[PDB]
Amino acid sequence: GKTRGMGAGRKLKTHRRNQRWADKAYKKSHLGNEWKKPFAGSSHAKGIVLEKIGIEAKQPNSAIRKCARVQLVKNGKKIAAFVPNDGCLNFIEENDEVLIAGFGRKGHAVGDIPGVRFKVVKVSGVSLLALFKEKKEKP
Amino acid sequence: MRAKWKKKRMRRLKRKRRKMRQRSK
Amino acid sequence: MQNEVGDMVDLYVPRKCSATNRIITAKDHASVQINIGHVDENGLYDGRFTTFALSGFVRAQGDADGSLDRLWQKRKAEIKQ
Amino acid sequence: KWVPVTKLGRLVKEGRFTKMEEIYLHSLPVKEHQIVETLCPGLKDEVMKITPVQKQTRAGQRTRFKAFVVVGDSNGHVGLGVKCAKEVATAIRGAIILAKLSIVPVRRGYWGNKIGQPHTVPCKVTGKCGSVTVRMVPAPRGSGIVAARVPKKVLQFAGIDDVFTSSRGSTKTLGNFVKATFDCLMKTYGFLTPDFWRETTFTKAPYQEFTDILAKPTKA
Amino acid sequence: VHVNFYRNYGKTFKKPRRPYEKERLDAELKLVGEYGLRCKRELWRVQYALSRIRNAARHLLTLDEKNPRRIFEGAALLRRMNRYGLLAEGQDKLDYVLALTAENFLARRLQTLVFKAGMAKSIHHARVLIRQRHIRVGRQIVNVPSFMVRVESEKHIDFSLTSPFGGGPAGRVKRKNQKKASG
RNA sequence: UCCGCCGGCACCUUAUGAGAAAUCAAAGUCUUUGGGUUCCGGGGGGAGUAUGGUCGCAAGGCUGAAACUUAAAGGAAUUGAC
RNA sequence: UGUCUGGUAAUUGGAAUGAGUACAAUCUAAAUCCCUUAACGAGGAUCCAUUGGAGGGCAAGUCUGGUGCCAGCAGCCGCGGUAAUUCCAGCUCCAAUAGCGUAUAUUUAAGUUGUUGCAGUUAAAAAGCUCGUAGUUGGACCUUGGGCCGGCAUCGUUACUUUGAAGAAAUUAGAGUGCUCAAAGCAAGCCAUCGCUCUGGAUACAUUAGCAUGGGAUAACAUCAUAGGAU
Ligand SMILES: [Mg+2]
Ligand SMILES: [Mg+2]
Ligand SMILES: [Mg+2]
Ligand SMILES: [Mg+2]
Ligand SMILES: [Mg+2]
Ligand SMILES: [Mg+2]
Ligand SMILES: [Mg+2]
Ligand SMILES: [Mg+2]
Ligand SMILES: [Mg+2]
């Protein structure tokens, strides 16, 4: 089984160093690929609303999720961001200024929405929550 | 699908890829 | 077991097997207890007896008979027979 | 109301006992649930879970509710009952009966000092039920119970005040979790400490020293 | 460099691991109710302080008796407890301090002592009176209900000289009423 | 033919053992965790695939990813249905 | 039946007070904040508490109205197809409370990185098999009876263990100290002084490596019969 010699510290250390790589989280963090994602290791990002789209919810659900195809200004990547809080697709217009955030599962699709990992947090410098509750008006 | 025949399909794909790569070097 | 005053603190003191010394649990239903009566020089039962307890483990082993026989041979020496 | 059907109950009913530690002392097979009613003064009962299990028949699925009950005053006595019945009421009642029938004594020791009212298990004790292994380790006077909800309830009913617990295996399985906890609570009285190994003296069993009233005074 | 950066600073409460438990919620609400607190933080900080003290005592009890790094701080801890009215004169051992509990601490608060000294109609009236600058410990005005009193100062709590309840001029309400009745 | 010893391939009964169980006299002596040592696994796919290195006449062998996708895949046993 | 206890009312009363305002003094290099304080200052005491939720995990509704696999909610399981405990709202209730929600990173949870402490017949995982250097690991044997209780050499080497020294402060642990409490600070305290307590401003830990003292049990090296040995 294990090497229990008192003189075998190097063997145990090297074996653990080799075997840490099978870990999903450790390999995710120490491979450096997290910098090639659209956010490039950032909590939020900013973007321009390229277009407004809808995606059919995955089975067995049946609905149309009002997403938005936007383009990040920091690297130019094009991503789809969810728009929650029904009626909040109306606030978003064309080529508009939005603040995007992750969806919650750390680079994983959330819910029945196929392949969406971002949600719109702000539009034109105003939070979607304030507009939804009529606390603020779009400028 | 039987994994034996999947392995055979993979081998055919590998040899075809090798031929295609040898075509253009 | 013993408090700083010097009194009992556990509910009871268990029995331990007279062959393997392992204690007898309150839910050990294979553990038994035998009283072997003693006789007089004529061969009359005098009303006193020697008590042995065997745990379920030693019984289920099958060494209960040998252990009890050895215990009786050893014990009868002090109290004659 | 109650007509004893076994020697132990017939012995108890008139009042030839005070506590139930002498029954434990001879490891007698308690089989009537009124014995623990009469002997143990305080009993508290909380049901732990009501799990519906199913058996698929040709017509449909026959469902039966299995109930878990924990019994015992918080002064060293605890028991566990499991009963599966057609509907929840009889399941709960039968599980209460079984739990009262399965009361065992627990040993409470000290952590490092013998200031009165012992509050902890005496040793490191473990219990395995299928896959769920539970371990309790002695804790100082002010620690409290460090455990999940199920072992916490079992230990509170057992009378333990402070302990350090661990767990391994699928503890989501309530039956195995609680059975392992209760089983190792039984083991708490099983370790041979250096104080216990004073030579034992023997006492007549209740079946043997009450022979006078057990030959043929059937029920009078 | 900014010298003000060198001032140490810390936190005093911890918050519980499991937020939604019925028995714990009822226990905490029970304690808050008759100890006249404001939120679960006023009790969580008491739990935090008690946990620190208990951890220190448990660490001390793990050492050998003849260890000076046991004797010195054992004496110090027992001195502090006997000074704050927590441990009785019959509990002079390191084992008794492990048995301390939160209500022992909450019994020594200034609001609790004011209520139990008969000066307040209820433990909420005590807190209201404390926060309104009506209570002085020794000679010093105190308006902090969490003020933990010591045994030597337990015999000096009294309404302040400036207080109308301790021999002061009438408050603005009574003076306004006298002004109204003057004409 | 009978008895005994050492070595080997197995077999039968039984746990007081272990195990998720089937079962195992070793797959036991494990939360009461430590005899020595080698190799090797980290949810299911992508995939033993891409590429580099290297051995081979070739077929191929050894070493061997990533993006992306997914909430199950799987083991043992149970009751029905077929 | 009785009296007391306890709880609710945009009911009735009185008292209390600081948020605010402001003479004034104090603070300050000068101002300002704080502390102190004239005068004013609360009844729906409008001097109006918020953030998230109410199927499970997880504390709190199978209330009412709207929608009808649509709009949407939903971290996961899932909800909505004319009776929605899950969506849109009202009422009510729950948790925290001057704080709460959301996203990333990572600590715990994770005994799912396992030295402590995981696994490998069937769940993923023993190399087809053997040999083999480095590495790791290696049987037993050699002081016990013995009681008592300034010199002066020249020497097997280490690991281990004890004791000591040197060891930056800050941070951490920790003694004292009533900043009104606390987080803090290293201050202060007292007869009621032409002052005193020499006032205090402790103490630990700080891997490994290095220096020195004692111990020789357990371990590693070569030393072991051409006497080229000791005296
Ligand atoms: Mg995998
Ligand atoms: Mg609602
Ligand atoms: Mg609930
Ligand atoms: Mg409805
Ligand atoms: Mg594992
Ligand atoms: Mg398979
Ligand atoms: Mg396999
Ligand atoms: Mg093999
Ligand atoms: Mg050796």
Q: What is the DSSP letter of D200?
A: P
How far is the C-alpha of E43 from the C-alpha of D211, rounded, in Å? Answer: 62
Q: Which residues contact E16 (CB under 8 A, 6 or more apart)?
A: E24, E44
Residue B2 to residues B6, B8, B11, B25, Cα–Cα distance (Å)? 7, 10, 15, 34
How far is the C-alpha of E81 from the C-alpha of E148, rounded, in Å? Answer: 12
For residue A19, report the distance from its CA to the centre of ligand 7, in Å.
20
State CA D72 to chain mean position distance.
7
Resolution in angstroms, to 1 decimal, for this deposition?
2.9
The answer to whether the Cβ–Cβ distance between D196 and C16 falls below 8 Å is yes
Instruction: Tokens 């090297």: give the residue.
Output: A14
Task: Return the SS3 of E87.
Answer: coil
How far is the C-alpha of E145 from the C-alpha of E131, rounded, in Å? Answer: 7
Chain A window 39-68: residues with CB closer than 7 Å to nucleic chain G are 41-44, 54, 57, 60-66
Distance from CA of E143 to the nearest CA of D (A): 33
Q: E22-35 and E41-61 helices cross at what angle (nearest 10)?
A: 100
| Residue D108 and residue D122 in contact, taking contact as beta carbons nearer than 8 Å | yes
Q: Which residues contact D189 (CB under 8 A, 6 or more apart)?
A: C14, C25, C26, D104, D105, D106, D107
For CA atoms A126, A131, A137, A138, give the dihedral sign.
positive
| Residue C71 and residue C51 in contact, taking contact as beta carbons nearer than 8 Å | no
How far is the C-alpha of C44 from the C-alpha of C59, rounded, in Å? Answer: 30
Element (H, E) at D67: strand D61-71
Method: cryo-EM
Report residue E76: phi and psi, to 5°.
-65, -45
Q: Which residues contact A129 (CB under 8 A, 6 or more apart)?
A: A85, A135
Chain D positions in Cβ-Cβ contact with residue E95 (cut-off 8 Å): 113, 115, 141
Q: Which of D102, D81, D83 is nearest to D186 (CA)?
A: D102
How far is the C-alpha of D134 from the C-alpha of D30, rounded, in Å? Answer: 27
Instruction: Tokens 């216990």: give the residue.
Output: D196
Strand-strand pairing, D145-146 and D163-168: parallel
Distance from CA of C72 to the nearest CA of D (A): 16
In sequence order, the β-bridge partners of residue A46 are A99
How far is the C-alpha of D6 from the C-alpha of D33, rounded, in Å? Answer: 11
Task: Return the SS3 of D211.
Answer: helix
Strand-strand pairing, D125-129 and D132-137: antiparallel
Chain E window 139-178: residues with CB closer than 7 Å to nucleic chain G are 140-144, 146-150, 153, 162-164, 168, 170-177
Element (H, E) at D94: helix D88-101
Chain E positions in Cβ-Cβ contact with residue D112 (cut-off 8 Å): 61-62
**Would you state the structure tokens that stand for residue C75, as one six-digit string?**
């014990």
Q: What is the DSSP letter of E153?
A: G
In chain D, what is the greatest distance between 2 CA atoms, to the nearest angstrom?
A: 65
CB atoms within 10 A of CB D167: 17
Burial of A110 from C-beta contacts in 10 A (0-12 / 13-18 / 19+): middle
For residue D52, report the distance from its CA to the centre of ligand 4, in Å.
30
Chain D window 53-72: residues with CB closer than 7 Å to nucleic chain F are 55-58
How far is the C-alpha of D100 from the C-alpha of D73, rounded, in Å? Answer: 11
Chain E window 45-74: residues with CB closer than 7 Å to nucleic chain G are 52, 56, 69, 72-73
Task: Return the SS3 of C80.
Answer: coil
Chain A contact partners (≥3 CB pairs within 8 A): none
**Would you state the structure tokens that stand for residue E47, as one six-digit string?**
């739990």
Q: Which residues contact E169 (CB under 8 A, 6 or more apart)?
A: E175
In sequence order, the β-bridge partners of residue C16 are C23
A33 touches strand F (CB under 7 A): yes
Burial of A131 from C-beta contacts in 10 A (0-12 / 13-18 / 19+): buried
| Residue C53 and residue C14 in contact, taking contact as beta carbons nearer than 8 Å | no
A114 touches strand G (CB under 7 A): no
Instruction: Tokens 């099978």: give the residue.
Output: A22
Task: Return the SS3 of D219.
Answer: coil
Residue of D nearest to C51 (CA): D202
How far is the C-alpha of D40 from the C-alpha of D43, rounded, in Å? Answer: 7
How far is the C-alpha of D144 from the C-alpha of D156, rounded, in Å? Answer: 10
| Residue C4 and residue D114 in contact, taking contact as beta carbons nearer than 8 Å | yes
Rg of chain C over all Cα atoms, to the nearest angstrom: 16
The answer to whether the Cβ–Cβ distance between C2 and D195 falls below 8 Å is yes
Q: What is the DSSP letter of D38?
A: H
Chain E positions in Cβ-Cβ contact with residue D140 (cut-off 8 Å): 58, 61, 98
Instruction: Tokens 């402070």: give the residue.
Output: D162
In sequence order, the β-bridge partners of residue D81 are D69
Q: D149-158 and D174-187 helices cross at what angle (nearest 10)?
A: 30
- Report the half-sphere exposure of D208 (CA within 13 A, side-chain side): 13
Residue A69 to residues A34, A47, A55, A100, E159, Cα–Cα distance (Å)? 22, 10, 11, 11, 70
Q: What is the DSSP letter of D5?
A: -
How far is the C-alpha of E32 from the C-alpha of E13, rounded, in Å? Answer: 16
A114 touches strand F (CB under 7 A): yes
How far is the C-alpha of C59 from the C-alpha of C73, rounded, in Å? Answer: 19
How far is the C-alpha of E44 from the C-alpha of E24, rounded, in Å? Answer: 12
How far is the C-alpha of E157 from the C-alpha of E136, rounded, in Å? Answer: 6
Strand-strand pairing, E158-159 and E135-137: antiparallel
Of the residues D46, D114, D115, the best mutation for testing chain E's interface (the one with the most E CB atoms within 10 Å of its CB) is D115
Report residue A56: phi and psi, to 5°.
-70, 130
**Would you state the structure tokens that stand for residue E85, as one six-digit string?**
């009215």
Task: Return the SS3 of D107.
Answer: coil
Q: What is the DSSP letter of B14?
A: H
For the stretch D210-217, contacts whose Cβ atoms lie closer than 8 Å and that sit 24 or more positions apart, written own/partner, are D210/D11, D210/D16, D213/D11, D214/D7, D214/D10, D214/D11
Strand-strand pairing, A64-72 and A44-56: antiparallel
Residue A56 to residues A90, C60, D202, Cα–Cα distance (Å)? 19, 68, 80
For CA atoms E97, E99, E102, E108, give the dihedral sign.
negative
For residue D218, report the distance from its CA to the centre of ligand 4, in Å.
68
CB atoms within 10 A of CB E173: 8
CB atoms within 10 A of CB E40: 17
D81 CA from G226 C1′ (Å): 88
Burial of A2 from C-beta contacts in 10 A (0-12 / 13-18 / 19+): exposed
In chain A, what is the greatest distance between 2 CA atoms, to the nearest angstrom?
A: 72
Of the residues C2, C7, C12, the best mutation for testing chain D's interface (the one with the most D CB atoms within 10 Å of its CB) is C12
For the stretch A106-110, contacts whose Cβ atoms lie closer than 8 Å and that sit 24 or more positions apart, written own/partner, are A107/A37
| Residue D211 and residue D142 in contact, taking contact as beta carbons nearer than 8 Å | no
3-state helix, strand, coil in chain E (%, to 5): 55, 5, 40
| Residue E15 and residue E41 in contact, taking contact as beta carbons nearer than 8 Å | no
Q: Which strand F nucleotides have any atom less than 7 A from protein CB atoms?
A: 15-16, 19-21, 31-32, 34-43, 47-51, 59-60, 66-70, 79-81
Residue of D nearest to E98 (CA): D142
State CA D92 to chain mean position distance.
17
Show which of residues 187-206 on chain D sit within 8 Å of chain C, judged by CB atoms.
189-190, 192-193, 195-197, 200, 202, 205
DSSP string, E5-49: GG----------S-S--HHHHHHHHHHHHHHT-SSSHHHHHHHHH
Chain D positions in Cβ-Cβ contact with residue C59 (cut-off 8 Å): none
| Residue E130 and residue E145 in contact, taking contact as beta carbons nearer than 8 Å | yes
Instruction: Tokens 């081998």: give the residue.
Output: B11
